[PDB]
Design a protein around this nucleic acid. Structure first.
Ligand SMILES: [Mg+2]
Ligand SMILES: [Mg+2]
Ligand SMILES: [Mg+2]
Ligand SMILES: [Mg+2]
Ligand SMILES: [Mg+2]
Ligand SMILES: [Mg+2]
Ligand SMILES: [Mg+2]
Ligand SMILES: [Mg+2]
Ligand SMILES: [Mg+2]
Ligand SMILES: [Mg+2]
Ligand SMILES: [Mg+2]
Ligand SMILES: [Mg+2]
Ligand SMILES: [Mg+2]
Ligand SMILES: [Mg+2]
Ligand SMILES: [Mg+2]
Ligand SMILES: [Mg+2]
Ligand SMILES: [Mg+2]
Ligand SMILES: [Mg+2]
Ligand SMILES: [Mg+2]
Ligand SMILES: [Mg+2]
Ligand SMILES: [Mg+2]
Ligand SMILES: [Mg+2]
Ligand SMILES: [Mg+2]
Ligand SMILES: [Mg+2]
Ligand SMILES: [Mg+2]
Ligand SMILES: [Mg+2]
Lengths: 60, 144, 185, 260, 67
RNA sequence: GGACUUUUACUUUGAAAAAAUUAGAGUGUUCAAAGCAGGCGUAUUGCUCGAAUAUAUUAGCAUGGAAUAAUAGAAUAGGACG
RNA sequence: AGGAUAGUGGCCUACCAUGGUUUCAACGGGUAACGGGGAAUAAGGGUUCGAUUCCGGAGAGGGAGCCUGAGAAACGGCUACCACAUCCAAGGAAGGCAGCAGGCGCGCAAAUUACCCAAUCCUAAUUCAGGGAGGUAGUGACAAUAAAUAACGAUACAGGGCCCAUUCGGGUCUUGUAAUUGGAAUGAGUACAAUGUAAAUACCUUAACGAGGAACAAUUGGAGGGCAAGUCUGGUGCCAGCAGCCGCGGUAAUUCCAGCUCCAAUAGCGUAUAUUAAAGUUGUUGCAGUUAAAAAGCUCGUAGUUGAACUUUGGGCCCGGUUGGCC
């Protein structure tokens, strides 16, 4: 039941993670327009229906 | 008659039997004993404040293997010593010693979380500043 | 010390947060009706819950019960007045069968779209929010207005709207000013 | 505690005053006077809320201080004066006369009477007793002490008071078949004739009353006020005559006379 | 727009029954010059400490300080 | 007013159970939460609808019922009828 | 029996009697108890809460006592003591925010030393004076209501078409993509004014300004399962960390640290603690007790609970309210 483990490595992985900045991109619509986008994306633009539907495909 | 009395005039027996047997329940026993106010680090409250006495490296329970980076805190309103986990990558650097910290339970109503042995509180704020705000760089600790 | 003001919550949230069936059906309602939230669906489902509960205990009461007659007729009258319940099927058994789509059909946003006048539900909403529709002689900028079956023939463009008259609109005015500036007098 | 209360919080006033929930922490607390607090109608409530002659209490006081209003033939400049059942309210301006009679919803109605009706009121005999010097007297429901009553007058009877002189003109006994007016309880405002009166010695005599359409109800004797013989009241009844329509038929006539 | 209107049978009764604030609204009165509510209350509480007219107190205070 | 009173549980109806609140009737607060308003003319000298209703448990009160479950009665007749 | 009281009463006194309550829970102890109207949740039954807008009660640092008064055992009345505490020239003198605002302290935890009597009402000798009662505004993501952050064209490729579009045109029909391209629309904001108001602030209304990245840029959590959403890419290599729980991490990590993409709710979304449902895991409805936890070793037995059947049934007559049923 030791309580005096090493504390030197705290924050290691985070501090050594290669910093990359977010890529600026066009803003999404907010509110009723975004629900409109979701509706066309899932029910009108429906092209890939793997299983029943697919929502975040990986590259393949 | 499968046990219990069924007479129209057996209300006293049934209510007393229920009173006797509600002591077998954890929540009813704790509430009626007032154990949160009496025997609990937080005196029944949701959060508490304390002073960091020392930084601890707690070795996590098997099969995990890690140093969990808790702090010993002395509560302002009680003087009781507790161990509080400091949640995030880093964030032990933000805590330091002799700093005031706002502690919370973790969600298991007592009952130490996960692989962290004997630790039932987590640091939420340090020096009046959210650990989340410090970890995400939204804000800074007041040095003076 | 004063009489407390009364207030109520107008929605409830569903039981299971993540049901693919409910999520799909809600998004289909939002897309078909141009809604902003799932709360807009929840508010209707909440209204059905109160209506269905009231109709339910009334139907528990036997026929010719004075309370069942009085309240059941008032509930039937209101739902027929708003158009959710058809002019026929004027019964408590039929108010029990009402759907969310029935109520969403009577929103001003839907009625502005279905009476020409908007060419879209999303167009209908922005026109409504932008004070272009008067239900009678009264501008109504709430898309959830519940047209009550006597106002349908009175829904039109606001008289103080550039689609109603008397002003050609702020942006049109600035652009016409620029053209006058470039051209002359 | 420690003494009499001077305030009446809104939401603690009598409901039949029909005061709005909001727009005020308080209600007019009726002054001490002829009628009990819960059974009264303060002059400010009558002039402002019911007759709309005044927009606020300041205007009610302005009206009263010029000595326009009078209750039973006296000016009553008091704003919270506790006018009650069968009180006569005269406005010399507008030449208007009112008698405070409950409508069939248990609320004081704006009921107009003529000058000849306003010349008198009716009082229910609360007690009959010998005073000092052995002089008999009756006490009415509005606190009037009337000396030398007719010996035939008993308790629960009704007297006609001249209201110019505090004198009894005639009286009505309390017997089966006589028209009565319900002045309390859940049947307040109903009018009918006594079918019979059951005693219950030691407490709470009850009265069986049926109205025009043969609807019977039972009320405690304390709420029963004799107002005439079979038909033909001694007072001008308000609209409705205490029939107590049901809500269904109430609604039927709403939709009848609202659509012409 | 919807409001409320009062028409009096003459100006004098208008000035008798109308509130002061409405008469000041119409220029029919003048907004009386009075001190702040706190100033009036503080002056009243200061004058509670004097018994009588107080000019005897002022005379004695002057004479005691002078001699 | 009685040579006049077996007691009780239970259930029915009535009443009572402040207002707010709860349910609920009406009413386009622009909708809604709300609020108790308001509506209609001939706006030329005012006419008119409302501010309901239900529930509110036990105890007490009045009332109908007399199944259910207790209780009491004439046996040393000290019985009833008269 | 007397005394006292406004009055009943061991309320008190004198004398007298030996009573009074209690396993139907007296007496005592605890309460992170003021009581109720009510509140949350809930199929029904229930469970938890109610310091707090109304009603009743109690108190004004803690006790006690009393004056005036119709009414107070009053505290923005007094007297004394106890605790705390202010001024002082040391002689003395003055105190009571559980009123409003405000300060300290305590803490996870709660706002302005503002304006006004215009309204609601209340008091007074009183229409007039006064009222931190009350109202107004300020702070305020407690809770609640509604509901912006875009809409619509033209140009790009889809394709579902008909005379076997032959191989595509036809005045097909544009739902989706072209960080293009076009003119429209509006309030967030800002203000003439009016309205509002006791005076103002704001709202409602409104002249003139007010979107192109319409930067006038929505967030909070998540993406193995529960549980909606990636086996994409870089990092780390049982470390750092994550993880309510099962589990991830030891060199291909869908679970950590990030970027991209996606999902959920959305002006809100997480976290802790409590409580309700889920819990038929408290059970009356409605649990279980051979072996999973639980039939006393056995019998007697009081209080409790429960307790076989039987006493006017049957038939007949009359009144007599309701649905329609036939002009
Ligand atoms: Mg048992
Ligand atoms: Mg008081
Ligand atoms: Mg509404
Ligand atoms: Mg005595
Ligand atoms: Mg306490
Ligand atoms: Mg309580
Ligand atoms: Mg309480
Ligand atoms: Mg407390
Ligand atoms: Mg007191
Ligand atoms: Mg204190
Ligand atoms: Mg005192
Ligand atoms: Mg004080
Ligand atoms: Mg006081
Ligand atoms: Mg204070
Ligand atoms: Mg707070
Ligand atoms: Mg005032
Ligand atoms: Mg206050
Ligand atoms: Mg924005
Ligand atoms: Mg990730
Ligand atoms: Mg999934
Ligand atoms: Mg259940
Ligand atoms: Mg079990
Ligand atoms: Mg076992
Ligand atoms: Mg044995
Ligand atoms: Mg055994
Ligand atoms: Mg039996």
């Amino acid at each position: 039941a030791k309580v005096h483990g090493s504390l030197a490595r705290a924050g290691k992985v985070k501090s050594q993670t290669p910093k990359v900045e977010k890529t600026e991109k066009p803003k999404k619509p907010k509110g009723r327009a975004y629900k409109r986008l979701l509706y066309t994306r899932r029910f009108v633009n429906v092209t890939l229906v793997n299983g029943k539907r697919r929502m975040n495909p990986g590259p393949s | 008659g499968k046990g219990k009395p069924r007479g129209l005039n057996s209300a006293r027996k049934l209510r007393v039997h229920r009173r006797n047997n509600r002591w077998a329940e954890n929540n009813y026993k704790k509430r009626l004993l007032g154990t949160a106010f009496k025997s609990s680090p937080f005196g029944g409250s949701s959060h508490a404040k304390g002073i960091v006495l020392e930084k601890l490296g707690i070795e996590s329970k098997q099969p995990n293997s890690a140093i969990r980076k808790c702090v010993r805190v002395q509560l302002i309103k009680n003087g009781k010593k507790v161990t509080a986990f400091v949640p995030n990558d880093g964030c032990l650097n933000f805590v330091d010693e002799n700093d005031e910290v706002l502690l919370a339970g973790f969600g298991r109503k007592g009952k130490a979380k996960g692989d962290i042995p004997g630790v039932r509180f987590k640091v939420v704020k340090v020096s009046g500043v959210s650990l989340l705000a410090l970890w995400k760089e939204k804000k800074e600790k007041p040095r003076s | 010390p004063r009489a407390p003001r009364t207030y109520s919550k107008t929605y409830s949230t569903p039981k299971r947060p993540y049901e693919s069936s409910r999520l799909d059906a809600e998004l289909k309602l939002a897309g078909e009706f141009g809604l902003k939230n799932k709360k807009e669906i929840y508010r209707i489902s909440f209204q059905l819950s109160k209506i269905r509960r009231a109709a339910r205990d009334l139907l528990t009461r036997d026929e010719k019960d004075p309370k069942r007659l009085f309240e059941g007729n008032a509930l039937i009258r209101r739902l027929v007045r708003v158009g959710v319940l058809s002019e026929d099927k004027k019964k408590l058994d039929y108010v029990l069968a009402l759907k969310v789509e029935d109520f969403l059909e009577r929103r001003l946003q839907t009625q502005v779209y279905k009476l020409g006048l908007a060419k879209s539900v999303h167009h209908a909403r922005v026109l409504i929010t932008q004070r272009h529709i008067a239900v009678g002689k009264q501008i109504v900028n709430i898309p959830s207005f519940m047209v009550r079956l006597d106002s349908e023939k009175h829904i039109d463009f606001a008289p103080t709207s550039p689609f109603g008259g008397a002003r050609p609109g702020r942006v049109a005015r600035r652009n016409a000013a620029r053209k006058a500036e470039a051209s002359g007098e | 505690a420690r003494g009499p209360k001077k305030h009446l919080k809104r939401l603690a006033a009598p409901h039949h005053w029909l005061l709005d929930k909001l727009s005020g922490c308080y209600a007019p607390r009726p002054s001490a006077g002829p009628h009990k607090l819960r059974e009264s109608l303060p002059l400010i409530v009558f002039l402002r809320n019911r007759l709309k002659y005044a927009l606020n209490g300041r205007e009610v006081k302005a009206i009263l201080m010029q000595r326009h209003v009078k209750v039973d033939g006296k000016v009553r400049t008091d704003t919270t004066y506790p006018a009650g059942f069968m009180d006569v309210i005269t406005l010399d301006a507008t030449n208007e006369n009112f008698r405070l009679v409950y409508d069939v919803k248990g609320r004081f109605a704006v009921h107009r009477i003529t000058d000849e009706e306003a010349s008198y009121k009716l009082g229910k005999v609360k007690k009959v007793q010998l005073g000092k010097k052995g002089v008999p007297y009756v006490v009415t429901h509005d606190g009037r002490t009337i000396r030398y009553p007719d010996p035939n007058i008993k308790v629960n009877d009704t007297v006609k008071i001249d209201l110019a002189s505090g004198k009894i003109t005639d009286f009505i006994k309390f017997d089966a078949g006589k028209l009565v007016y319900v002045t309390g309880g859940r049947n307040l405002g109903r009018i009918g004739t006594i079918v019979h009166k059951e005693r219950h010695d030691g407490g709470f005599d009850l009265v069986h009353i049926k109205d025009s359409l043969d609807n019977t109800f039972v009320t405690r004797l304390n709420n029963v006020f004799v107002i005439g013989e079979q038909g033909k009241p001694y007072i001008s009844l308000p609209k409705g005559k205490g029939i107590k329509l049901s809500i269904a038929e109430e609604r039927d006539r709403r939709r009848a006379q609202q659509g012409l | 727009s919807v409001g409320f209107g009062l028409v009096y049978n003459s100006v004098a009764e208008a000035k008798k029954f109308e509130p002061t604030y409405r008469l000041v609204r119409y220029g029919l009165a003048e907004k009386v010059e009075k001190a702040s509510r706190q100033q009036r209350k503080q002056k009243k509480n200061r004058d509670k400490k004097i018994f009588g007219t107080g000019k005897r107190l002022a005379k004695k205070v002057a004479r005691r300080n002078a001699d």
